[PDB]
Design a protein around this ligand. Structure first.
Ligand SMILES: *Cc1cc2c(cc1C)Nc1c([nH]c(=O)[nH]c1=O)N2C[C@H](O)[C@H](O)[C@H](O)COP(=O)(O)OP(=O)(O)OC[C@H]1O[C@@H](n2cnc3c(N)ncnc32)[C@H](O)[C@@H]1O
Ligand SMILES: *Cc1cc2c(cc1C)Nc1c([nH]c(=O)[nH]c1=O)N2C[C@H](O)[C@H](O)[C@H](O)COP(=O)(O)OP(=O)(O)OC[C@H]1O[C@@H](n2cnc3c(N)ncnc32)[C@H](O)[C@@H]1O
Ligand SMILES: *Cc1cc2c(cc1C)Nc1c([nH]c(=O)[nH]c1=O)N2C[C@H](O)[C@H](O)[C@H](O)COP(=O)(O)OP(=O)(O)OC[C@H]1O[C@@H](n2cnc3c(N)ncnc32)[C@H](O)[C@@H]1O
Ligand SMILES: OC[C@H]1O[C@H](O)[C@H](F)[C@@H](O)[C@H]1O
Ligand SMILES: OC[C@H]1O[C@H](O)[C@H](F)[C@@H](O)[C@H]1O
Lengths: 576, 576, 90, 90
C-alpha cells in the first residue's frame, strides 16, 4: 500500500470497474478498495454462475444470491411465540434483538433492500439484463436539444454495451425462447414489440453462457503486469472505507479514511481524485458519515450545510411476479411439422419432417431438434429437447405500457422450486414499474444505531407515491395477468403477486444527478461531480434522478463513462 | 498439461490434499484433477466461511452450503398438482421429469445425500468437527494387539490433527459455551464427560475464526514456486475423471481417462501411482465405470469379476436434531456475581462485582464482560454480550451412549431461521448414530440412466438396519430429549426430529477397508491399496468399514497418511 | 342462523368443512422418510385411510364432497339463486 | 367458505372476495362410475371419477375467466397476499 495515488475508487462493482477501466487505461495510478473479499475464482470479480456445475444445476444458484444479500434495515420483530416451555427465558417486551434497527418503521420500509459485499459487488450474481432507457425514463444530458441529447446517450450506451458485451441473440437457438417470443409477437400484432432481453453475456456453447460481470469491464488484476506493463492499479479487498475528508472551503477532498479489516488498523489514503462507487445505499452512508447531508432522523428545522437533497427523492421500482405452465396449444405447436406413425416405444415408431417443405411452420434446425428428441426419448411426452435454453423475452417500456418486462427463467427464484411440473413448461414473468421521485421518500442514517461495520445504520422512510406510481403499479399487475395468459395458466405456488419492496434491487436517486443543485434538487452534475467539490465523483444507480422501470446498471455505467471523460480532461496522470 | 506424472490424484478435497501434502512433500511429480472449479478466493480450496462478511452475518452461510449440495439420487416425483388452468399442458402420468432417477425407490433412499463439486470439496463448507474414533467405532490396523493398534491410531491421528490444526480451546472465552458446558458437566456428574468439540480451526480474534479446510492441509498452489522451488504439483480444475484403465492381468492401472470440461476434449493421463479421492459416492462411480464391482441393478446371479464388496455394506448415520431456548435459571446464573442497584436507564444505575471475591462463581474475565454489557446496553434484558461466541460442546461416543453429539450453533440450519427469539438464547443439538454395515445396503449405478456429467447414475438401496442400529437411533432421540431439557425447552419450529436420511453426509463403507478381501468383505487393504492392484489407492470415508457415529473425516485422513507411507516406501519419485 | 355464528362469521367455514366428506380420494404417495428407524415403515404405497385404489389422481374431482345430514347441503350453502339465461338452460 | 387460514392482519372491512364460475361442455367421456369391488363408508359401490376439463371452449373460457377476474378485481383494489388469483381444486 502506498501513501499517494492519482485516483482512488471505493467499490469494485461494475461501476467502480468502469472508472478503473477508463482511468487505468488513460494512465492514472489507481487504487480501488472494497469492503468485501475476492471469492469468485481466479477471475477476480467474475460472475459466480459461470461454473460448469452451476450451469448444469441452475436451480441451485438462487442459494448463491441469497447468501450474499444482506438486508439493509430490519425492523424490530414483534412475532408472538407463546409455545416456549415454562423453563425457557421468555421476553417481557419486543426488545431490540438480532441486529434489528429500532429506527425503522416496519410500514415505511424497503424490507427487501439488501447489499452485497464481495469483490465485484452485485455483478457477481446479477441477471445481466441491460436495456437502454428511452427518453421518458432517462435524465437529460443536453438541455433544449432532444436530438443532441439522444445522440449523446447513444454514444455513451454504445460504449457501455461494449464494456459489458451486451448482445441480443445469445438465445436465438432456443425452442422455448422462440415459442414464447413468436406467440407474443402475434398476439400484440401492431400494438407492442417483443425481442430478446439485452443481456451482458457471451454464449460459449449450446449449454454454457459466459455471463458478464465487473470482471468483464475490468479484470481487476494488479498492474503493472505482463499484459499491461505501463498501467498502475492495485485492488485492496477487506478494506472498509469510512469517510472522505473535506477541506475547510468544502471545495476539495483531502483524504479517504479506511479500516483494514484483516489487521484492524485504520489509515488514510491521499489521491488527486476520489470516486465513490459503493452502491446506492453505501455511497450515501459514506457521504453522511463525512458531513454531507444530514445525519440522523430527518429534521427539516436544522437544514443540512451541504448537499441537502442527499438521501431524498429515492426511488425503488415496484415488482410483480408470477410463473406459468406452457399451454397445450403452444406445446402441440412445437411439433406441428412432424408426421408421427406408430406408438412411442415400438419398433415401428416414426417421427419425420421434410427439410425445406414449403408448408413447414419452423426452420429445419428446429424440426431436427424436435425429431431427434422425440425419437431418442420415446418415454418423454414433450417435444422440447432436454437442454433447450430458457426464454429471455421482453417488451421494453413504452408510454402505453410504462413498465419493463422480463419473461423467461431467472435464477433468483422466490420460493422452494417446484419439482412436480416439468421445467420445460415453466416461464417466469417479472414486470418492473417506475417510481416518481419524491422529497419525502428518504434513506437516512441513524446517529445512534450502527451496522455490522460500525457505520451509521441505514433507515428507510418510503412509500410508493400516490398518483401515477400507484395507478401504474396496479395497471402493471393487470398487464402481467393479461399477457401471461396468452402463454399458459399460472403455476400454483407462483401466483401473481407484488414482491417485497426493494427485493428488486433497483434503488435510485439516493445521490441524484442534475444540472443545478438547487433547481434540480440534486447532488452531482452531469459529469457526476459533487457540487462545489473539484475532485469528488459519485458513480452508480444513486445518480439516476428519474422514474425508471428498466434495469438501471447500463445507464449508471454510461454516466460513469461521461464522468471519466471529465476526469481525463481535467486531471493529469502522475509520471510512471 | 504433461503426458506423464509420478502420481495422479482425483479430487481436491481434504483427503486428496492429504495425499498431495505427503507426496508433493516427498518429492513426487504430482497432478491433481477436480471436476469442480476454483471458487474460494485466492487461497485455493479454503473455507468459504472465512470472510469478514460471513463471520459478521453467519446466518447467511447456510445458503452457501445449500448452493453446493447437489442431490445424489432424486426419485420420480408423484405430487398431484390439480389446480393448473385447463389451458396449461397437463401430464397424464408421473413421467421422468427434472433430472429424477427412475431407478430409485423413494422408500429405500438416502434422499438427503448430496455431493459438492468445487476445488476443496466439502471442506470449503464443513463444520470442522474432528473427533477421534474410540476402539468401538474404529477399524483395526493391527490384529491381535490392542495396545499396538491404539498406538498406531494415536500416531496417525496426531499427524492428522496437525494437518487440520485441530484444537479444543478456540471457544474457551465464550460465556454461552461455558454456560452450557458447565451445566452439563454438573448434571452428568460421574456418568458422562463433556468437552469442547475438537475443531479444525484457529481463532484469529474474539470475533474471527480461521476455519480449516483442504487449503490448510495443502495450499494447492502449482509448484515449483518461490516458497517450494524443488516441488512439482499441478492442479487441473474443471476436469471430469471418468475411468481408470486396467491391464489385462488386473494387476496395475495403466491410465486415467479424463474429460476437460472447458474444451470438451477427452484425454488420457499416465502416472506410476493412481489415487482416487473423489468422495464416498464418486470414487465408487469411477470404479464401477472402470469395470470394478457390478454396473446396473444388482444381480446376485451374475457375480462381479473384481471387488465384489464394492458398493455394498454402505453406512450412513442417523441424525436427530432440535434447538432449545436457554432456561431462565441459566441466564440468571450468568450474572449471579453482580450487585445491581437502581433501575436500568437511570443515572443511578449500577452493576458491580469484586475482582477476586472468594465467593464469586465466575472468573473476573467473565464478570467484566457481563458488567460491561449490562452497563453499556441498559436497554438489553440479557447479561450475555452481543458478540459472545456460540457454544461448541460435546460428549463423545461411549458404550453407554453410543452416539456422537454436537451442541451449539451450526451454520447449516434446516429451516427459515427465527428472528423472534434472541440468538444468544439458542442452542442446537445434533446427535449422530452409528449404522451396522450390511451387505444388502447398497450404492449402485444405473446401466441406462446417466447423471449431469454423463456418468452412470447413482442409486441407493438403503434402510437403517433392524436390530441394534434402529434401537440405538431411537434411544439416541430420547437421549437428546433428556439432555437438551437440562439447558432449556425446545424452540418452536425446531422440535426434535430425525433428519432426511443422508443429510448428515457421513456416508461410509462404499469401498471399504479390511485385512482380507474375501474374509472381511472389502475393497482395499490397510494401506488403502485396491486388492490385486500394485498402484491404485482409494482415499476417503468410503474406506471406513465400521459402524461409527463421530464425524469421519479425521479418520479418513489418518488412513490416507498411512497409505502415503506405503507409497513412499514402494515407489521412487522421478528425477526433477 | 344462530346469533353466535352471525357474531363470529369467520368460524362458519369450520361447520362447512366438518360436513364435506370427500367423494374419491386417490391412493397417497407422499414420501415420509424422517420416521424413526424403530417405527413400522411401508414398503409400498398401499391402500390406506379409506383411499380409492380405482381413482386416477390426475383425472379426479378431488374437491368433490358430499353432506349427509337432514337438509343436505342447504344446511351450509351460500344461498345464491340466480336464474339461468337461455344459453345455460335446457 | 374461506379457503385458507383467515387473515387477521388486514381490516376485514377492506376485504372483498371474487369467485368466477365457468361452464363445462358435457362430454360422454367425462364419467362418474362405481367400483364393483371397492365400497364406501356405507358399504355401497365406491364412487370414482374420470374427468378432465374439455379442451376447446371449456378450457379457453376458463382461462379467459381467470383473466377477467384479474381485470375486474383490480378496479376495486389489489390482491390480498395469501389469496392470490388461483383455480380451485376441481
Ligand atoms: C443481486 C441482483 C442484482 C441485480 C440483478 C439481480 C440480482 C438478484 N439483476 C440485474 C441487476 N441490474 C441490472 O441492471 N440488470 C440485471 O439484470 N442487478 C443490479 C446490479 O447488480 C447493480 O445495479 C450493480 O451491481 C450496481 O453496481 P455498483 O454501483 O458498482 O454497485 P455494487 O453494489 O455492485 O458494488 C459496490 C461495491 O462497493 C462495496 N462497498 C460497499 N460499501 C463499501 C465501503 N464502505 N467501502 C468499501 N467498499 C464498499 C461492495 O462490497 C461492493 O462490492
Ligand atoms: C457439506 C458438509 C460436510 C461436512 C460437514 C457439514 C457440511 C454441511 N461437517 C463436517 C464434515 N465432516 C467432518 O468430519 N466433520 C464436520 O464437522 N463434513 C463432511 C466432510 O466435508 C467430508 O467428509 C470431507 O470433505 C470428505 O473429503 P474427501 O474424501 O476429500 O471428499 P470431498 O467430497 O470433500 O472431495 C472430493 C472431490 O472430488 C471431486 N470429484 C468428484 N468426482 C470427481 C470426478 N469424477 N473427477 C474429478 N473430481 C471429482 C469433487 O469435486 C470434490 O471436490
Ligand atoms: C356445501 C356448499 C353447497 C352450496 C354452496 C356452498 C357450499 C359450501 N353454495 C350454493 C350452492 N348451491 C347454490 O345453488 N347456490 C349456493 O350459493 N351449494 C350447492 C347446494 O347446496 C346443492 O346444490 C343443493 O343442496 C342440492 O340439493 P339436493 O339435490 O337436495 O341434494 P343435497 O346434497 O342437498 O341433499 C341430498 C341428501 O340426500 C342424502 N342422501 C344421500 N345419499 C342417500 C342415501 N343413499 N339414502 C338416503 N339419503 C341419502 C343426504 O344425506 C342429503 O341430505
Ligand atoms: O428479483 C430481483 C431481480 O429480478 C430480476 O432478475 C431482474 F433482472 C433483476 O434486475 C432484479 O430486479
Ligand atoms: O447437518 C449435517 C451436518 O451437521 C453437522 O454440521 C455435522 F458436524 C456435519 O458433520 C454434518 O453431519
Amino acid at each position: 500500500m502506498d501513501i499517494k495515488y492519482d485516483v482512488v475508487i471505493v467499490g469494485s462493482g461494475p461501476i467502480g470497474c468502469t472508472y478503473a477501466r477508463e482511468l487505468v487505461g488513460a494512465g492514472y495510478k489507481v487504487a480501488m478498495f472494497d469492503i468485501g473479499e475476492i471469492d469468485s475464482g481466479l477471475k477476480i470479480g467474475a460472475h459466480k454462475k459461470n461454473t460448469v456445475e452451476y450451469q448444469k444445476n441452475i436451480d441451485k444458484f438462487v442459494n448463491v444470491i441469497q447468501g450474499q444479500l444482506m438486508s439493509v434495515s430490519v425492523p424490530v420483530n414483534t412475532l408472538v411465540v407463546d409455545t416456549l416451555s415454562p423453563t425457557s427465558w421468555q421476553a417481557s417486551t419486543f426488545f431490540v434483538r438480532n441486529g434489528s434497527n429500532p429506527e425503522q418503521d416496519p410500514l415505511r420500509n424497503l424490507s427487501g433492500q439488501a447489499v452485497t459485499r464481495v469483490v465485484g459487488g452485485m455483478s457477481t450474481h446479477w441477471t445481466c439484463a441491460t436495456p437502454r432507457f428511452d427518453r421518458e425514463q432517462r435524465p437529460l444530458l443536453v438541455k433544449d436539444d432532444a436530438d443532441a441529447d439522444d445522440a449523446e446517450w447513444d454514444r455513451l450506451y454504445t460504449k457501455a454495451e461494449s464494456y459489458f458485451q451486451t448482445g441480443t441473440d445469445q438465445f436465438k437457438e432456443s425452442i422455448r425462447h422462440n415459442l414464447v417470443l413468436n406467440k407474443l409477437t402475434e398476439e400484440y400484432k401492431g400494438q407492442r414489440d417483443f425481442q430478446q432481453i439485452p443481456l451482458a453475456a457471451t454464449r460459449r456453447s449450446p449449454t454454457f453462457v459466459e455471463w458478464s460481470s465487473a470482471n468483464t469491464v475490468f479484470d481487476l488484476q494488479n498492474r503493472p503486469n505482463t499484459d499491461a506493463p505501463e498501467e498502475r492499479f492495485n485492488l485492496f479487498p477487506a478494506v472498509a472505507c469510512e469517510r472522505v475528508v473535506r477541506n475547510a472551503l468544502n471545495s476539495e477532498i483531502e483524504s479517504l479514511h479506511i479500516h483494514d479489516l484483516i489487521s484492524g488498523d485504520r489509515f488514510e489514503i491521499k489521491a488527486d481524485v476520489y470516486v465513490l462507487t459503493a452502491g446506492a445505499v453505501h455511497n450515501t452512508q459514506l457521504l453522511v458519515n463525512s458531513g454531507f447531508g444530514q445525519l440522523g432522523r430527518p429534521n427539516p428545522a436544522n437544514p443540512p450545510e451541504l448537499l441537502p437533497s442527499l438521501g431524498s427523492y429515492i426511488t425503488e421500482q415496484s415488482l410483480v411476479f408470477c410463473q406459468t405452465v406452457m399451454s397445450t396449444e403452444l406445446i402441440d405447436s412445437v411439433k406441428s411439422d412432424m408426421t408421427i406413425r406408430g406408438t412411442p416405444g415400438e419398433l415401428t415408431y416414426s417421427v419425420t419432417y421434410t427439410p425445406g417443405a414449403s408448408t413447414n411452420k419452423h426452420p429445419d434446425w428446429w424440426n431436427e431438434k424436435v425429431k431427434n428428441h422425440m425419437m431418442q426419448h420415446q418415454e418423454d411426452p414433450l417435444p422440447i429437447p432436454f437442454e433447450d435454453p430458457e426464454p429471455q423475452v421482453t417488451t421494453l417500456f413504452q408510454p402505453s405500457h410504462p413498465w419493463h418486462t422480463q419473461i423467461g427463467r431467472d435464477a433468483f427464484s422466490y420460493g422452494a422450486v417446484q419439482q412436480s411440473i416439468d421445467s420445460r413448461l415453466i416461464v417466469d414473468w417479472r414486470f418492473f414499474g417506475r417510481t416518481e421521485p419524491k422529497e419525502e421518500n428518504k434513506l437516512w442514517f441513524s446517529d445512534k444505531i450502527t451496522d455490522a461495520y460500525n457505520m451509521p445504520q441505514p433507515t428507510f422512510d418510503f412509500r410508493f407515491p400516490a398518483g401515477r406510481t400507484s395507478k401504474e403499479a396496479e395497471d402493471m399487475m393487470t398487464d402481467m395477468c393479461v399477457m401471461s395468459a396468452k402463454i399458459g395458466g399460472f403455476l400454483p405456488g407462483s401466483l401473481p403477486q407484488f414482491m417485497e419492496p426493494g427485493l428488486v434491487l433497483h434503488l435510485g436517486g439516493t445521490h441524484r444527478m442534475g444540472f443545478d443543485e438547487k433547481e434540480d434538487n440534486c447532488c452531482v452534475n452531469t459529469d457526476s461531480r459533487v457540487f462545489g467539490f473539484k475532485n469528488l465523483f459519485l458513480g452508480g444507480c444513486g445518480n439516476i434522478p428519474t422514474a425508471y422501470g428498466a434495469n438501471p446498471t447500463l445507464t449508471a455505467m454510461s454516466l460513469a463513462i461521461k464522468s471519466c471523460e471529465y476526469i481525463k480532461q481535467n486531471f493529469t496522470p502522475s509520471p510512471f
